[PDB]
Design an enzyme around this catalytic site. Structure first.
Site, short mmCIF file in Angstrom:
data_model
loop_
_atom_site.label_atom_id
_atom_site.label_comp_id
_atom_site.label_asym_id
_atom_site.label_seq_id
_atom_site.Cartn_x
_atom_site.Cartn_y
_atom_site.Cartn_z
N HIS C 192 0.86 -1.27 0.02
CA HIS C 192 -0.04 0.05 0.21
C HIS C 192 0.84 1.17 0.13
O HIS C 192 0.38 2.18 -0.53
CB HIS C 192 -0.75 -0.07 1.26
CG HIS C 192 -1.80 1.12 1.40
ND1 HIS C 192 -1.69 2.30 1.84
CD2 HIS C 192 -3.15 1.19 0.69
CE1 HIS C 192 -2.61 2.99 1.73
NE2 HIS C 192 -3.41 2.50 1.12
N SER C 196 1.08 -1.15 -7.12
CA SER C 196 1.36 -2.31 -7.79
C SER C 196 2.38 -1.96 -8.80
O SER C 196 3.25 -1.08 -8.86
CB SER C 196 0.00 -2.53 -8.67
OG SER C 196 0.15 -3.92 -9.59
N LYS C 218 -13.45 -7.09 -13.00
CA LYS C 218 -12.55 -7.67 -13.64
C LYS C 218 -12.08 -9.17 -12.88
O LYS C 218 -11.83 -10.16 -13.62
CB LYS C 218 -11.19 -7.02 -13.92
CG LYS C 218 -10.19 -7.50 -14.80
CD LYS C 218 -9.27 -6.39 -15.26
CE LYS C 218 -7.80 -7.04 -15.72
NZ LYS C 218 -8.23 -7.53 -17.31
N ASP C 219 -11.80 -8.92 -11.60
CA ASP C 219 -11.57 -10.02 -10.65
C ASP C 219 -12.61 -10.91 -10.63
O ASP C 219 -12.62 -12.00 -10.66
CB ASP C 219 -11.07 -9.53 -9.32
CG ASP C 219 -9.93 -8.71 -9.33
OD1 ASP C 219 -8.88 -9.18 -10.26
OD2 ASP C 219 -9.73 -7.91 -8.49
N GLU C 262 0.88 -35.76 -3.61
CA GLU C 262 -0.03 -35.05 -4.40
C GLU C 262 1.10 -34.18 -5.53
O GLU C 262 2.20 -33.86 -5.53
CB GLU C 262 -0.81 -33.99 -3.61
CG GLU C 262 -1.76 -33.16 -4.60
CD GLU C 262 -2.72 -32.55 -3.80
OE1 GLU C 262 -2.97 -32.60 -2.58
OE2 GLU C 262 -3.69 -31.66 -4.51
#
Ligand code: HEC
Ligand code: HEM
Ligand code: HEM
Ligand code: HEM
Lengths: 74, 74, 370, 65, 98, 237, 56, 181
Positions: C192, C196, C218-219, C262
């Site tokens: 923050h 980004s 969009k998400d 896995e």
């Protein structure tokens, strides 16, 4: 300057119902605002359809299992 | 942090339009598809050849392993 | 007035050249909440006892009203979870997130939190791969001299896996997502202060835009694809990733001919399995993960991204071959056509990272004179 | 009464891949029987006769039933 | 021969297709924030519009036409004078402190 | 190893269900044949309701078999006719007795065996129908038998099934094959009592998500259209 | 058009907006289940309970 | 730089006429963390099955190395917990904390979170007061007309308390302190 300034054309992008600059809006705006909110609404429908089913699975899991009802009436 | 005290801007103009005044998907097929291919021609050569070898090493990895369990003349 | 802190998810500056990749950056918030939500309702009928746990799973898949789905929304959900990460993380290399040193380290501690969490999640149902899946991995910590036997016996609650081993995981496993739930906020906090990081790698301060209309939906669009790709598997191929054996009851007195945990360990498990020595590969394992903390001292280019470093792309997508190889090579047994691979593929992994990506920027700077 | 399976296996031993694997199986059979001490068997040639067999059977068997 | 490659590699990066320059793609540290801050307005503002449009096209994944592309010979080194000036002060700032 | 083929089924299709008529005869098999040595402990007669049998009919089988339940007021235990809540009759009280009843070998459970063995059904159907004479140069102890699909090709599996080993209700042929069909159909239901419903949500999902996904993809392209069509310029002196 | 006349009546005011949805959703629910189930029956005819629910 | 938010616990303005009462305002942070810490190590040997849970307590108090203490640091810890609250809350009346309307309501939702939590904590060991302690209280929700029988049967996982009632609490009970946290 700030008056030699000019706006380009979006006629490659606009809707067909407004390309005629000689016409006026307010004859398709009521429709143009309807078709898109229809998508917003129709979207909101199916999400609600998802919610009623997906949640009731969890809630019905909290409910009495099948194993107990076998012992209930008998 | 927020808008207002980031940086400086000078002599820049921004034009833009409502969404309602334009179709959502204009020129999707007409203009998008070449841009897809152009996006493709810039990336395939640096992405595929690893996976090309992978497909082969995935191939020969089985065949040699396939033969080894098959017997020898003795 | 706690309405001002939730502007970071409403009125936050963020770029505009953003791909569909960064859907994945928030799907974890949806995977995690969903997975927790699923598992929480799921543990309403789990039992932490050997004599009933495997049966207590069957209590769900048969007798609960639509609960049988929950075993798979959760389980295969954990696969879709990891599919985000190694599309979330290799991103940061292909774009250059890793310069944010205060954040990138946080991105590691999650991974070891999860990959040690998930290890405790496959084991609960006593699948005959639960047991040995817990034996082999945990046995390795005996590799250390003079303490390895202690901590392992100490965690086994005895001298070998038993009921006491189980419950100790179920609490350690029911809890860490909440520890992740808060660390998630921390991971966004150090963000923050800086925000980004575009694909180009350029400081895009000039073109930071709102968040409520644009990236929210969009998400959500990505979450739809997630729920789709999740609803598909559970409905059409739930037996795909979750190995068949795990439906077997546990029995220490018999093993399967082939062992593999896995699928997602397998890039890492193969690195160890390559090394014939015991300890000589263990330290390589965590080093293979903890190298991520060591990368940001290897940002040789005074550029950031790799959209503008074509040679880096030649290496980067080559790394994916190695991982996706070790993925497959790991899940296959020990024989001559495959040992020859992992002895190279393991070295290739360390090699591509610590030699050639640095070598690029030292050259690419010289190709353009700085 | 009859097994419909034998009706289908019978037809398929005539097809190419079965006949060829069959002939290989016979030389194997004589490769072993002719020799005295052998840590060898025709599990080798048997499976290829069968992996080729049952593939045809897949195509049509549940048309009868 | 060399010089054919610098022109070539310069075409494979692609940033000459988004109307950008060499300097614009630099990573930002405190050493460079000073240099950028030191730049003149006539040139500084000319940085932003180069950047600002390339972003909008990276959004679309689009590019500019071939004419608007950047030529190698015009890849001006406008920033290097301001830059090395800084590190000439950095290395003095440190070795003098030693 | 040996890889079984991909035999088709009435349920292989991604919106295909199980032939419940095939299940109805399949359950006859487990009781007449497999319930002598296979301990299906994760199932009860009640789960057959809405699947192959009814309440009263399936209950007639609970009346058939005795079950150990109930501490007597004396302080002892006894036998009663079972009910729909009661799980299947376990053949043997513990595993070791089964090893003793065999040549040292154990029968596995068959509840989740399908999903716990590669290929599932196609393994099993070809397993029974993979019996043949051993090949040359092979030797086996007594009790063991040959079957290529089993790992090691060596198994203490007595041949359970053969043509005209029993008879069914409606009167369909009791071949080694049709019986082998209903039984594998039966076991898939064991580890999937939800197949009839999985596809139902299997289908509801698509005609929603296939229907939403464009609309959300439009609402995306709706809002972003401001920037998908945004122009700029640069007008200093 | 139908689009415009729809707008002025329902999608204009928010208090009216949510009214359409739950109502139409309710009427939508009654149809979607009937659409799917019949098709699921149409595919797997002669396999389900309701096609053997008369013999017994 | 998450060092600036932790000034509220280091460099925060606060008064000087302060009694010893407001020790209690922060002991909950110590009770809660301690109680969680205790219970977490404690649930390493709890079992959520009727046939073994009560015994699984005995697995602790007898066979665990110094674990027998943990049953009581936790359990009677929960009593010392409540001793803080009704010395923490009546305070706000005797001093007038309750004018802070945005805070006082929060002080309630904790209490109903806890008093419905603790109700799920006394019940785990199947003490013969666990059962009836869960019966009586939960039975009351049948007092409502036309839904009381539903939600109660719905929470009982049947028609009465059983194994299914237990596990549904143990997860609801192992979790809320984090929601409180
Ligand atoms: C005579 C008692 C008996 C009968 C009747 C019987 N089984 Fe078996 N079954 C066994 C025993 C003993 C084994 C142990 C195999 C081994 O130890 O490898 C076994 C093994 C199996 C397995 C294990 C396969 C695997 O991959 O591990 C399956 C499945 C199975 N039986 C199914 C069946 C089916 C299908 C039938 C009817 C066609 C049947 N059983 C009837 C005794 C029986
Ligand atoms: C990142 C977090 C987690 C991971 C990686 C993880 C991993 C797993 C996996 C892969 C399974 C599959 C077991 C199976 O399919 O049979 C599982 C089962 C289980 N999970 Fe977790 N899990 C996580 C979080 C949780 C949470 C949040 C809960 C409860 C709130 C939970 C409770 C359970 C339980 C009770 C089981 C047993 C069900 C079963 O084995 O089928 N897990 N876990
Ligand atoms: C539950 C786990 C996680 C959550 C909730 C989470 C959350 C987020 C979110 C919402 C973003 C912004 C979206 C974006 O940048 O595209 C982000 C970005 C980022 N994440 Fe994650 N993340 C998680 C795991 C990880 C992991 C495992 C790493 C490993 C390196 C990591 C490293 C990063 C970095 C470096 C960024 C910066 C983005 C940028 O540079 O633009 N995160 N994280
Ligand atoms: C405000 C929070 C909590 C309250 C009011 C509470 C209440 C209680 C009480 C009073 C007992 C006493 C049982 C006894 O003495 O026999 C108990 C037992 C237990 N607590 Fe909780 N508890 C809380 C939180 C927790 C937490 C955080 C955990 C785990 C991390 C936990 C796990 C257990 C377990 C497993 C038992 C069974 C032990 C026993 O019954 O002796 N509880 N709980």
């Amino acid at each position: 300057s700030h008056t030699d300034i000019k706006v380009p054309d979006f006629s490659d992008y606009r809707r067909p119902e407004v390309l005629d600059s000689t016409k006026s809006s307010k004859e398709s705006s009521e429709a143009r605002k309807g078709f898109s909110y229809l998508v917003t609404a129709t979207t909101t429908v199916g999400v609600a359809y998802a919610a009623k089913n997906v949640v009731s699975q969890f809630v019905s899991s909290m409910s009495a299992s099948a194993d107990v009802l076998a012992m209930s009436k008998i | 942090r927020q808008f207002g005290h980031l940086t400086r801007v000078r002599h820049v103009i921004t034009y833009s339009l409502s969404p309602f005044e334009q179709r959502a998907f204009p020129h999707y097929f007409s203009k998008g598809i070449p841009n897809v291919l152009r996006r493709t021609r810039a990336c395939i050569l640096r992405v595929a050849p690893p996976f090309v070898a992978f497909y082969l090493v995935y191939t020969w990895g089985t065949q040699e392993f396939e033969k080894s369990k098959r017997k020898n003349p003795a | 007035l706690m309405k001002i802190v939730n502007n970071a998810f409403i009125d936050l500056p963020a770029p505009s050249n953003i791909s569909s990749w960064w859907n994945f950056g928030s799907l974890l918030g949806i995977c995690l909440i969903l997975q927790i939500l699923t598992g929480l309702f799921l543990a309403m009928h789990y039992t932490s006892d050997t004599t009933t746990a495997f049966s207590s799973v069957t209590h769900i898949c048969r007798d609960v009203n639509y609960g049988w789905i929950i075993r798979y929304m959760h389980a295969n959900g954990a696969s879709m979870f990891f599919i985000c990460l190694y599309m979330h993380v290799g991103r940061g290399l292909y774009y250059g997130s890793y310069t944010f040193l205060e954040t990138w380290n946080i991105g590691v501690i999650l991974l070891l939190t999860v990959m040690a969490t998930a290890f405790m999640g496959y084991v609960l149902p006593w699948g005959q791969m639960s047991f040995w899946g817990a034996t082999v991995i945990t046995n390795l910590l005996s590799a250390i001299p003079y303490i390895g036997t202690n901590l392992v016996e100490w965690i086994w609650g005895g001298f070998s896996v038993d009921k006491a081993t189980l419950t100790r995981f179920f609490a350690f496993h029911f809890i860490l997502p909440f520890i992740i739930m808060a660390i998630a906020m921390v991971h966004l906090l150090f963000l923050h202060e800086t925000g980004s990081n575009n694909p180009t790698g350029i400081s895009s301060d000039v073109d930071k835009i709102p968040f409520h209309p644009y990236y929210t939906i969009k998400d959500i669009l990505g979450a739809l694809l997630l729920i789709l790709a999740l609803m598909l598997l559970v409905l059409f191929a739930p037996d795909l990733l979750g190995d068949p054996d795990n439906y077997t009851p546990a029995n220490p007195l018999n093993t399967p001919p082939h062992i593999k945990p896995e699928w997602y360990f397998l890039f890492a498990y193969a690195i160890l399995r390559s090394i014939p020595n015991k300890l000589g590969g263990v330290l390589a394992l965590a080093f293979s993960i903890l190298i991520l903390a060591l990368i940001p001292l290897l940002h040789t280019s005074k550029q950031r991204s790799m959209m503008f470093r074509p040679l880096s792309q030649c290496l980067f997508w080559a790394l994916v071959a190695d991982l996706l190889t070790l993925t497959w090579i790991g899940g296959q047994p020990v024989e001559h056509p495959y040992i020859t691979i992992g002895q190279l593929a393991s070295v290739l992994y360390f090699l591509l990272i610590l030699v050639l990506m640095p070598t690029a920027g030292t050259i690419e700077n010289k190709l353009l004179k700085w | 009464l009859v097994d419909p399976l034998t009706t289908v296996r019978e037809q398929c031993e005539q097809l190419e891949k079965c006949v060829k694997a069959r002939e290989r199986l016979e030389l194997c059979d004589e490769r072993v029987s002719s020799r005295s001490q052998t840590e060898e068997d025709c599990t080798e040639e048997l499976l290829d006769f069968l992996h080729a067999r049952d593939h045809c059977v897949a195509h049509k068997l549940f048309n009868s039933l | 021969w060399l010089e054919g490659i610098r022109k070539w590699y310069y075409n494979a990066a692609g940033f000459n297709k988004l109307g950008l320059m060499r300097d614009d793609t630099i990573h930002e540290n405190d050493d460079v924030k000073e240099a950028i801050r030191r730049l003149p307005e006539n040139l500084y503002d000319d940085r932003v519009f180069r950047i600002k449009r390339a972003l909008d096209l990276s959004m679309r994944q689009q590019i500019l036409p071939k004419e608007q592309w950047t030529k190698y010979e015009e890849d001006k080194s406008y920033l290097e004078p301001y830059l090395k000036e800084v590190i000439r002060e950095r290395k003095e700032r440190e070795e003098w402190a030693k | 190893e040996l890889h079984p083929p991909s035999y088709p089924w009435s349920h292989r299709g991604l919106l295909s269900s199980l032939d419940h008529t095939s299940i109805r005869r399949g359950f006859q098999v487990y009781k007449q044949v497999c319930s002598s040595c296979h301990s299906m402990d994760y199932v009860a007669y009640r789960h057959l309701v809405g699947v192959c049998y009814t309440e009263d009919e399936a209950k007639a089988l609970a009346e058939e078999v005795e079950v150990q339940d109930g501490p007597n007021e004396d302080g002892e235990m006894f036998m009663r006719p079972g009910k729909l809540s009661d799980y299947f009759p376990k053949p043997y009280p513990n595993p070791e007795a089964a090893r003793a009843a065999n040549n040292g070998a154990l029968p596995p459970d068959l509840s989740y065996i399908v999903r716990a063995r590669h290929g599932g059904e196609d393994y099993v159907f070809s397993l029974l129908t993979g019996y043949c004479e051993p090949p040359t140069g092979v030797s086996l102890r007594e009790g063991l038998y040959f079957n290529p699909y089993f790992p090691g090709q060596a198994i203490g599996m007595a041949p359970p099934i053969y043509n005209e080993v029993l008879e069914f209700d409606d009167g369909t042929p009791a071949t080694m094959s049709q019986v082998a069909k209903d039984v594998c159909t039966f076991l898939r239901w064991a580890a999937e009592p939800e197949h009839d419903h999985r596809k139902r949500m299997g289908l509801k999902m698509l005609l929603m998500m296939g229907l939403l996904l464009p609309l959300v993809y439009a609402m995306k392209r709706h809002k972003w259209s401001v920037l998908k069509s945004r122009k700029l310029a640069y007008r200093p002196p | 058009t139908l689009t415009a006349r729809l707008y002025s009546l329902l999608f204009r005011r928010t208090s009216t907006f949510a009214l359409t949805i739950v109502v139409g959703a309710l009427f939508f629910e009654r149809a979607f289940d009937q659409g799917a189930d019949a098709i699921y029956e149409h595919i797997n005819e002669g396999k389900l309970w309701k096609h053997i629910k008369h013999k017994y």
